[PDB]
Amino acid sequence: MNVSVAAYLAVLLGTFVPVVFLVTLYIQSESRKAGSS
Amino acid sequence: DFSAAVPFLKRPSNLDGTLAGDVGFDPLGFSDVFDLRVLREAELKHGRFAMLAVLGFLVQEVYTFPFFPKMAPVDAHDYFVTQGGGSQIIFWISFVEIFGVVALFELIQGKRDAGDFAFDPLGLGKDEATLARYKVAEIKHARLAMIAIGGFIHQFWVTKQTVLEQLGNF
Amino acid sequence: NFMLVFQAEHNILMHPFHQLGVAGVFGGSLFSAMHGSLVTSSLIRETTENESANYGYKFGQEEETYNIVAAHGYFGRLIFQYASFNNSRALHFFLGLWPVVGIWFTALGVMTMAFNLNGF
Amino acid sequence: DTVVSSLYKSLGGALDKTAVYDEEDQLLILSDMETFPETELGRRRVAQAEAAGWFTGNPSFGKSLIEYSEETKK
Amino acid sequence: ALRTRLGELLRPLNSEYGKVAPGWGTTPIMGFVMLLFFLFLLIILQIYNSSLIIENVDVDWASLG
Amino acid sequence: SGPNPNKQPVELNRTSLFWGLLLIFVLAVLFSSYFFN
Amino acid sequence: MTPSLSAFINSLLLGLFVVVIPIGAALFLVSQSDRVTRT
Amino acid sequence: GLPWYRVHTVVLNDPGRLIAVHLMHTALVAGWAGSMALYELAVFDPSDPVLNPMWRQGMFVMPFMARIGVTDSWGGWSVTGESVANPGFWSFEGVALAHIGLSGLLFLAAVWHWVYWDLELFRDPRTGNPALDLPKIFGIHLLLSGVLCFGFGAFHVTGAWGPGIWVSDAYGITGKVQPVAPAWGAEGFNPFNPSGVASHHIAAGILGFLAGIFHIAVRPPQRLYRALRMGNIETVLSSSIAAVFWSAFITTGTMWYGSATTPIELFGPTRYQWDSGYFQQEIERRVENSLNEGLNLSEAWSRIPDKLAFYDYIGNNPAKGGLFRAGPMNKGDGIAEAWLGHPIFQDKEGKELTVRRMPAFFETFPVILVDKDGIIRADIPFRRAESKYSIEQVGVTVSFYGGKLNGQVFKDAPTVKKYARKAQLGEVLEFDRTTLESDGVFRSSPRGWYTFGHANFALLFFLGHLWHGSRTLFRDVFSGIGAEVTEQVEFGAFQKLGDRSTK
Amino acid sequence: LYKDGIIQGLGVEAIPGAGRPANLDGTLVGDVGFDPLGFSNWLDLRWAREAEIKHGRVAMLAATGMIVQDAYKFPGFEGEFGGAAMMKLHNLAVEQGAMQQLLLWLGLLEIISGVPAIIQTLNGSERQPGDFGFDPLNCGANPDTLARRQLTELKNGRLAMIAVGGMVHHYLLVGRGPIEFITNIPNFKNPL
Ligand code: CLA
Ligand code: CLA
Ligand code: CLA
Ligand SMILES: CC1=C(C#C/C(C)=C/C=C/C(C)=C/C=C/C=C(C)/C=C/C=C(\C)C#CC2=C(C)C[C@@H](O)CC2(C)C)C(C)(C)C[C@H](O)C1
Ligand SMILES: CC1=C(C#C/C(C)=C/C=C/C(C)=C/C=C/C=C(C)/C=C/C=C(C)/C=C/C2=C(C)CCCC2(C)C)C(C)(C)C[C@H](O)C1
Ligand SMILES: CC1=C(C#C/C(C)=C/C=C/C(C)=C/C=C/C=C(C)/C=C/C=C(C)/C=C/C2=C(C)CCCC2(C)C)C(C)(C)C[C@H](O)C1
Numbered sequence A: 001m002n003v004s005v006a007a008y009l010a011v012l013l014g015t016f017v018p019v020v021f022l023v024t025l026y027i028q029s030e031s032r033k034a035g036s037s
Numbered sequence B: 001d002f003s004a005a006v007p008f009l010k011r012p013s014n015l016d017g018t019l020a021g022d023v024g025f026d027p028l029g030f031s032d033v034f035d036l037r038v039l040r041e042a043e044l045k046h047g048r049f050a051m052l053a054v055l056g057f058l059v060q061e062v063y064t065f066p067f068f069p070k071m072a073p074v075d076a077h078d079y080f081v082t083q084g085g086g087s088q089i090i091f092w093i094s095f096v097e098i099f100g101v102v103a104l105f106e107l108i109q110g111k112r113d114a115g116d117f118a119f120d121p122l123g124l125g126k127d128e129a130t131l132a133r134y135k136v137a138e139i140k141h142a143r144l145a146m147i148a149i150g151g152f153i154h155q156f157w158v159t160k161q162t163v164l165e166q167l168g169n170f
Numbered sequence C: 001n002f003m004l005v006f007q008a009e010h011n012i013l014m015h016p017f018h019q020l021g022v023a024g025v026f027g028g029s030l031f032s033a034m035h036g037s038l039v040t041s042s043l044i045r046e047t048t049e050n051e052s053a054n055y056g057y058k059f060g061q062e063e064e065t066y067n068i069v070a071a072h073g074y075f076g077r078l079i080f081q082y083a084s085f086n087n088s089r090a091l092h093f094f095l096g097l098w099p100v101v102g103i104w105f106t107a108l109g110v111m112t113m114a115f116n117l118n119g120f
Numbered sequence D: 001d002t003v004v005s006s007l008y009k010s011l012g013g014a015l016d017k018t019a020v021y022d023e024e025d026q027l028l029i030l031s032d033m034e035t036f037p038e039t040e041l042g043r044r045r046v047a048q049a050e051a052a053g054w055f056t057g058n059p060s061f062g063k064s065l066i067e068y069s070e071e072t073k074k
Numbered sequence E: 001a002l003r004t005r006l007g008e009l010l011r012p013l014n015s016e017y018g019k020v021a022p023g024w025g026t027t028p029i030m031g032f033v034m035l036l037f038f039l040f041l042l043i044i045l046q047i048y049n050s051s052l053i054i055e056n057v058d059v060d061w062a063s064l065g
Numbered sequence F: 001s002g003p004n005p006n007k008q009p010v011e012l013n014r015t016s017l018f019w020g021l022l023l024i025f026v027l028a029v030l031f032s033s034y035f036f037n
Numbered sequence G: 001m002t003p004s005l006s007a008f009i010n011s012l013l014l015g016l017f018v019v020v021i022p023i024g025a026a027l028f029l030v031s032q033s034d035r036v037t038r039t
Numbered sequence H: 001g002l003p004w005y006r007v008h009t010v011v012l013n014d015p016g017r018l019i020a021v022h023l024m025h026t027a028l029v030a031g032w033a034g035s036m037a038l039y040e041l042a043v044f045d046p047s048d049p050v051l052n053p054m055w056r057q058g059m060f061v062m063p064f065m066a067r068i069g070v071t072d073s074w075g076g077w078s079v080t081g082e083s084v085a086n087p088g089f090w091s092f093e094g095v096a097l098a099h100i101g102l103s104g105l106l107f108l109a110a111v112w113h114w115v116y117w118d119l120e121l122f123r124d125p126r127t128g129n130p131a132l133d134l135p136k137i138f139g140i141h142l143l144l145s146g147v148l149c150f151g152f153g154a155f156h157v158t159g160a161w162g163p164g165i166w167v168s169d170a171y172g173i174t175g176k177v178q179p180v181a182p183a184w185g186a187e188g189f190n191p192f193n194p195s196g197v198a199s200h201h202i203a204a205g206i207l208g209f210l211a212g213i214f215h216i217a218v219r220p221p222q223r224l225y226r227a228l229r230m231g232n233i234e235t236v237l238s239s240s241i242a243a244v245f246w247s248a249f250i251t252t253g254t255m256w257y258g259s260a261t262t263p264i265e266l267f268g269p270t271r272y273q274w275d276s277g278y279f280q281q282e283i284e285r286r287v288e289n290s291l292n293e294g295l296n297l298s299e300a301w302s303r304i305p306d307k308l309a310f311y312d313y314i315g316n317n318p319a320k321g322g323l324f325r326a327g328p329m330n331k332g333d334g335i336a337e338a339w340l341g342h343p344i345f346q347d348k349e350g351k352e353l354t355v356r357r358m359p360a361f362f363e364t365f366p367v368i369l370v371d372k373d374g375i376i377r378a379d380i381p382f383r384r385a386e387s388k389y390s391i392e393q394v395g396v397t398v399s400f401y402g403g404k405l406n407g408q409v410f411k412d413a414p415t416v417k418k419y420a421r422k423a424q425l426g427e428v429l430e431f432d433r434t435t436l437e438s439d440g441v442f443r444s445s446p447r448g449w450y451t452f453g454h455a456n457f458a459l460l461f462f463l464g465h466l467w468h469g470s471r472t473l474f475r476d477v478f479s480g481i482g483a484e485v486t487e488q489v490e491f492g493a494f495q496k497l498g499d500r501s502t503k
Numbered sequence I: 001l002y003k004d005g006i007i008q009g010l011g012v013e014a015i016p017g018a019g020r021p022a023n024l025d026g027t028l029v030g031d032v033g034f035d036p037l038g039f040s041n042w043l044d045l046r047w048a049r050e051a052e053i054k055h056g057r058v059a060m061l062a063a064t065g066m067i068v069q070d071a072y073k074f075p076g077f078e079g080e081f082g083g084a085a086m087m088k089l090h091n092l093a094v095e096q097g098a099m100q101q102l103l104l105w106l107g108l109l110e111i112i113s114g115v116p117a118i119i120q121t122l123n124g125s126e127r128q129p130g131d132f133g134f135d136p137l138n139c140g141a142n143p144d145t146l147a148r149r150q151l152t153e154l155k156n157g158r159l160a161m162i163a164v165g166g167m168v169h170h171y172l173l174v175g176r177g178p179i180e181f182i183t184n185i186p187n188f189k190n191p192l
C-alpha cells in the first residue's frame, strides 16, 4: 500500500493534541475542586 | 422677511444684509450651515483670482511676452507646466496661501474680517464711504469675473478661438 | 455496495416503504431538533451567568426544568395554535411513534423486496 | 429652511442634535432565579432516597466549580 | 487606573459611551442610502451574471486583450 | 495593573471528558482512512 | 441604453408599483384603522 | 465554572485585554503568512514558468504576493521568468521576514496589553466602568479604512507611488505587474477589467473617508441604539461576522468564475475555460489564420506557444482534483516537460477524426473518435466481439503537428490508440512522474482549494453570525426564562405580542 | 375665491350626493370637491397644488408648444431637425443638445427656485403653493382679478394636461402633429 507518510503525523497528532487538551481541562478542574475543600 | 433677490423665497437668516453685495441670495442656504465669514473669504479669494484671470486672458491674446512663445491662453498652461514657470507661479501662490491659512485661523477666532488683508497700498479706498462703495464694486466685479473666466476658457475648448478672435468671427 | 445493488435490482427508492422510512428518519431528526430547541429555549432561570445552564437542573428534582407553557405558546404562534402538542405525554408518544413506525415500514419493505416485490 | 439646512449638515445629523445618554445597561443578564416550594411528596421521596443512600458517595455531582466551591466554603 | 500620554491623547475619543441622539435621528437617510447601495449591488450582480448587459462592458476573459 | 476582576475558573466534568475523547478518537478513526490515501 | 438596462429599470419600477407600494399602502391603512387600545 | 466553550468570554468586558487577544491573533496570522512564504520559497522551483508555473506547484500564498507587486526574489529569479540582477528588499524573502518581524512585535504588544489592562482610556468618565464608545470607534476605523483604500487605489494600484498590480492578456501568455489607470465609468464594473480595481479603491475609499467623518461626528439615533444593542460589543461581532462571510462568498465567486483580480497564470485556469473550449478556440483560430497566411500544418502548429497549449489541458482544470488527493498539481499527472504537438487523426481514407474530450464531471470517459459532423466513426471498444467502430476496422493514423513530436506519422493501431487516450484529455504533453513520485491522479489548483476553503468558511461564518446575532438580541434571557414569560405567552392575553400595555 | 359657493367652494360638488372630502374645505382654489379616490387624506394638499399648478404650467407651455412647432419651426432649428415633430423631434433635439440645454437650465431653475421654495411652503412659509412671484407686467393688482386668475390658471392648465396627453397619444397612434391631426381628421387613411 502506497500510503502517505505525513498522514501518520496528521492522524497521530490530531488525535493527541485534542486528547491531551481534554485531559488537562479535566485534571485542572478536579484539582481545583479538591483544593477548594 | 423675504429676500429681495428671491421674493418667493424667505430671507436667509445669517444674511442680515451687512456684508457688501448681500441681496439675500442663498437659495440652497450654505450660510445657515457654515460660517458666513469663511464663505465670504472664499468668495473674495476666488473672485480676485477670477478678476486677474479675466484680465490676463485678454492681455495675453493682445500681447504675449517676446521671451515666451505665442500661445493662446489655455494652450499656455500645458506649456509652462514644463517650461518651468508654471511651477514658479503655483509655488509662490502656495507660499502666500500658507499665510492665508494663518489669516484664516485668525478669521475663525474673529480677529480678522472676511476677505480683508489691509491691502491699500496706495490708499485708494481710505474713505469710509468709498471703501463701502468699493467693497460693493469689488464683490460685484468678482462675481462677474467668476462667470467670465469660465466662459473664456470653456469657449476655447468648444471653439478654438481666443475670445478676442471668436468675438471677431462667430 | 449492498445499497447500490439493492437499488439496481429492486428500485428501493421508488418503493413506498423506503419512502416511509425516509420520512421516518427525516421527521425523527426534525422532531428531535424541534423538541430539543423548544425545551432548551424555555429553560427556567436557575443558573448564574458564569455557569453552564445545564447545572440549573439537579438530578432527581421534583419540579419541571422548563416552562411547557412558554414553548407551547411559541410553537403555536410559529405555525398555528392547533398544531402544537399542549399535552407532553402525547408529544413524547408521537416522538416515539414516528421513527419507530417509519423504520418498521422500511424494514418490512426490505423484507418484501427480499421476495422480489419491487418498487414502482 | 433651505436645502443644506434641510439635510441639517449643520444640525449634527439631519435629525441629530443634543444627544441624551442611553440608560439601559445592554450588557446585563437577568439573575432572578426561582424558588420552588418543597411538597410533602418531595420530602417523602428524598427521605426514601436518603435511606437508600442516593445523597452520598459523590457530593460534587451536578454542581459547577463555582457552585461546589462556594458550598464547600459554606 | 493607569494614566498615559497616549491614553490622555485618545481619551476624548472614548468619552461618549452611551450618548444617543433622541428619536429616529438620521434613520431616514440611512434607509435611503441602504436602498441606493442595494440597487448598486443588484446592478453589479446582474452585470457579472450577464442578466444586465451594458454596452462597452464585456464580461469575459477575452476583454482583457 | 493588578488583579483582573474578570478572572473566572474553567471546568470540564468527567462526562464531558469522555464525550470529547470519544469525539476525537472517532474523528481520527473516520479521517485516518482518508489522510493515508 | 441597451434592452437589458431598460428591462432592469422597468423591473425596478414594477417592483415598486406592484409589490412595495401596494403592500406598504395596505399596511399603513390597516394599521391606522385597526389600532391597539391602551398603548 | 466557565465551560470550555465560554472561556474566551472573560475578555468580553475588558477592552485592554480584548486588544491584547486581538494583537495575539494578528501576530499569529502574520507569523503564518511569513512562515508559509518561507516554506513555499523553500519548495518552489522557479526554473520553468511556462510548463511548471506557480499554480502547478501548489503555491497558495505566493500568488497573492505576486498579484500586487512582489514578483522578484533575492535569489535572482522572477515569477514572470526574467532573471533579476539587483532585487530590492521587498522580494518574497523580504516580505516573509517583514511578516515574521511584525508577528513578533504584535506578540510583544499583546503581552504589554495583557499585563497593563487597567487604563483610563477604557474607563467611561461618566460612570467609571470599563466601556467602549463603539459608534465613534467605528467612525475612527472607517476613516482608517477609507484612507488605506484610497491610498491603495491612488498610489499602489495606479503605480503613482507603487508597483501597480498584475495585469495579463486574454490568454495568460504575457502577464506582468504594471500600473493600471483608473477606469471611471461603466467599464470599471467589468469584473475582467483590472482598471476597475483602481477606480474602485479610490472612489470607495473617498466615500469611506467621508463616512468616517460622519460616524465620528454624528451620534447614533436612540431607536437604532436600543434596537441593535449598540452598547453591546457582540452586536459588532455579529455584524462583522456577517460582512466577513459576505466578503468570503464574493471572493469565492470571483475565484471560481475568475476576474481581473485572479489571473490564470497566478491561480491556474477555471473550469469554465475548459468547458467552453476557451483556449482550444484560440489555438484553432491562431492556426487557421496561420494557414490562411500560406503556412502548412507543421509550421502553423509550431507557432503555437507551449504555454497556450499547456492551458488547453484537462489536468490543469481545477474541477478534476479530489478532496483528499493532497499536494501540488505536479504530484498527480507529473511535472510537464514538453508539448508533443497536436495529434491529427487521419482515418483510413484520410478524414479527420477527433477524440471527444473528457468533461470535468467524468472520472473516466470512453474514448470515442467523433467525425467532423460528429457521427461516431471509431472508438476503443469495451466489448471487442461484434465491434463496428473499432480503430482496427475503420483504420486510423495519428499525424503529429507541432511540439517535439512534430512531423511524425504513426499509422499502427496500437500507437493510434495510445495517443487517442491522451487526446481525450486535451493537448498531449510529456510528464516527469519520478521527481515527486507522482501517482497519476489529478489534483486541484490553488483556485479550487481557495474556493473550497472559503466556501466552507463562509457557510460556517453564516452559522456564527446567526449565533452571535441571537446572543446579542437575547442577552437578557441568557441564563434562562423567568416567571414573566408565563403571563405574556398566553393566547389572547395581550392584543400585541410582548407588549403588556395592551390589555 | 372667485364666485365662492358658485363656481368653486363648499356648496359646489363635482359628484353630488357624495360628501365633500374631509380635507377639502373652501380655501383651496379650484375645489369643486372632487377627490373620488381620496388622496386628500394621505397627501399634503400643499404639495398637491404645487404639483397641479406646476404641471398645468409646463403643460400649457407644452400644448401651445406642439401647436406652434407645427406652424412655425424656427428656421435654424428647423434645418437641423429636418421637420421632425413631437417625439421624433425630442429624439433629434436631444442630439443637437437643444433638449440637453433645456434640461440643464430648467433643472437649475428647479434646484435654485423650485426645491427651496417647496421646502419652505411645506413648512410654514406664506408663499402659498405655486406662488413664485412672477408679475412683471403686474398684470393683476386687484384682489379680485387675481382670484379669477388663479382659478383660470388651474383650469386652463387642466385642459392643458388632458390635451398634451391627447396630442401625444394621437401622435403615437397616427403620425400627425396636432395642427396636422385636426386636418385629415379621420387620420386613418394613412397612418402618417
Ligand atoms: C466608479 C467607481 C467604482 C468602480 C469603477 C467600482 C468597481 C467595482 N466595484 Mg464598487 N464601489 C464603489 C465605487 C466603484 N466600484 C463605491 C463608491 C463603493 C462604496 C464603498 C463601492 C462598493 C463596492 C462593493 C461593496 C463591491 C464593489 C465591487 C466592485 C467590483 C464590481 C465587479 C466585480 O468584480 O464584481 C464581483 C462582485 C459582485 C458582482 C458583487 C456580488 C454581490 C451579491 C449580491 C453577493 C451575494 C452574496 C450572498 C451572501 C450569496 C448567497 C448565495 C450563495 C451562498 C450561493 C468592481 C471592482 C464588488 C467587489 O468587490 O467585487 C470583487 C463588491 O462587492 N464595489
Ligand atoms: C483556506 C486556506 C488554504 C488553502 C486554500 C490552501 C491551499 C493549499 N495548501 Mg495549504 N495551508 C493552509 C491553508 C490553506 N492551504 C494553512 C493554514 C496551513 C498551515 C498549517 C497550510 C499548510 C500547507 C502546507 C504545508 C502545504 C500546503 C499545500 C497546499 C496546497 C494543497 C492542499 C492540500 O493538499 O490539501 C489537503 C487537505 C486535506 C487532506 C484535508 C482537507 C479536508 C478537511 C479540511 C479535513 C478536516 C479534518 C478534520 C479537522 C478532522 C480531523 C480529525 C483528527 C482527529 C485526525 C494548496 C495550494 C501544499 C503545497 O503544495 O505547498 C507547496 C503543502 O505542502 N498548505
Ligand atoms: C471572529 C469571529 C468570532 C469571534 C470573535 C468569536 C467569539 C466567541 N465565540 Mg464564536 N463563533 C464563530 C466566530 C467567532 N466567535 C463562528 C464562525 C461560529 C460558528 C461555528 C461560532 C460559534 C460559536 C458558538 C456556538 C459559541 C461561540 C462562542 C464564542 C465566545 C467564546 C468562544 C470560546 O471561548 O471558544 C473557546 C474555544 C476553544 C477552547 C477551542 C475551539 C477549537 C475549534 C473548534 C477548532 C480549532 C480552531 C483552529 C485552531 C482555528 C480556526 C481558524 C479560523 C480561520 C476558522 C466568543 C465571544 C460561545 C458563546 O457565545 O459563549 C457565550 C459559544 O457557545 N462561537
Ligand atoms: C412652468 C415651469 C417650468 C417649466 C418649463 C418649460 C416647459 C419650459 C420650456 C422652455 C422652452 C421651450 C425654452 C426654449 C428655449 C430655446 C432656446 C434658448 C434656443 C436656443 C437656440 C440656440 C442657441 C440655437 C441654435 C442653432 C445653432 C447653434 C446651430 C444652427 O445650425 C441651428 C440653430 C440656429 C437652431 C419648470 C419645470 C421649471 C417648473 C416651474 O414651476 C415653472
Ligand atoms: C481642465 C484643465 C484646465 C483648466 C481650467 C480652468 C481654469 C477652468 C475654469 C472653469 C470655470 C471658472 C468655470 C465656470 C463655470 C461657471 C458657470 C457654469 C456659471 C454659471 C452661472 C449661472 C448659470 C448663473 C445664473 C444666475 C444666477 C444664479 C443668479 C442671477 C441670475 C442668473 C444669471 C440666471 C487647464 C486649462 C489648466 C488645463 C489642464 O490640463 C486641466
Ligand atoms: C417625449 C417622448 C415620449 C413621450 C411623451 C409624452 C409627452 C407623454 C405624455 C403623456 C401624457 C401627458 C399623458 C396623459 C394622459 C392623460 C389621461 C389618460 C387623462 C385622462 C382623463 C380622464 C379620463 C378624465 C376624465 C374626467 C372627465 C373628462 C370629466 C370629469 C371627471 C374626470 C374623471 C376628470 C415617448 C414616450 C414617446 C418616448 C420618446 O422617446 C420621447
Ligand SMILES: CC1=CCCC(C)(C)[C@H]1/C=C/C(C)=C/C=C/C(C)=C/C=C/C=C(C)/C=C/C=C(C)/C=C/C1=C(C)CCCC1(C)C
Residues within 6 Å of the ligand: H028, H029, H030, H031, H032, H035, H100, H101, H102, H103, H104, H105, H107, H108
Ligand atoms: C487544524 C487545522 C484546522 C483548519 C485549517 C487547517 C486544516 C490548515 C489546520 C490548521 C489551522 C491553523 C489555524 C494553523 C495556523 C498556524 C499558525 C497560526 C502558525 C503560527 C506561525 C507563527 C510563527 C512561526 C511566528 C513567528 C514569530 C517569531 C519567530 C517571532 C520572533 C520575535 C519575537 C517574539 C520578538 C521580536 C523579535 C522577533 C525575532 C521577530
